[PDB]
Amino acid sequence: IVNGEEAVPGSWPWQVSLQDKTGFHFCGGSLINENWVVTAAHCGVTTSDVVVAGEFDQGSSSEKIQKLKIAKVFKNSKYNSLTINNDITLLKLSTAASFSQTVSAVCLPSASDDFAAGTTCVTTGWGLTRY
Amino acid sequence: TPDRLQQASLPLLSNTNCKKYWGTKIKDAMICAGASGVSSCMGDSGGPLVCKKNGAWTLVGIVSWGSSTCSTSTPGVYARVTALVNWVQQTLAAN
């Protein structure tokens, strides 16, 4: 995120880091329950990638993080890689996350919910802070 | 990428308005947000856009695509979760 700021540690407990086998962070995701993570289809996740829950400082070795294996990658069949429409993938975890103060689920909306233009929301992540 | 998790508040746009920036790239299953002095950027992809309603945070967007230079005066584009949640529900149900 450009021109954001550092989060209170553990205050976005659904936020996970998707890392490849070399430990490189390449995308974010959100837990929606102990067994499932929602992310973007264009992240190109494979079952050799890892979901990391409970992390704040990716430079720290003292956090009690959970490195969770991915059993299967459900890319929404409606996803269009040419227009990037319907950009959503579900990850089914091999073993459930253990929910704690720093690891828990985000809510999902009803299909009919209205989130109007002008509403302030929040985005989080470990993306670049300067391009 | 920054070592520590970042956050930013940012407003939702209407699609109509977002099309002033991105034109026909904007589909119904997309929602735009930002153009407010902040921007999602490479490595944020796939994470949450959440809005607080009735005291709880709800996933309204998934970081999807935007300005190649993470321009803070251009809206970012997010997968619109209301358009996708019936699929999520279906998928969890069957697996």
């Binding site: 553990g10 205050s11 976005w12 407990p13 689920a105 985000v106 | 508040s9 709880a56 945070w57």
Partner: peptide, 10 residues
């Protein structure tokens, strides 16, 4: 869902 045990701040 949706309610962090550790409350986010601005």
């Amino acid at each position: 869902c949706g309610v962090p045990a550790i409350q986010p701040v601005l």
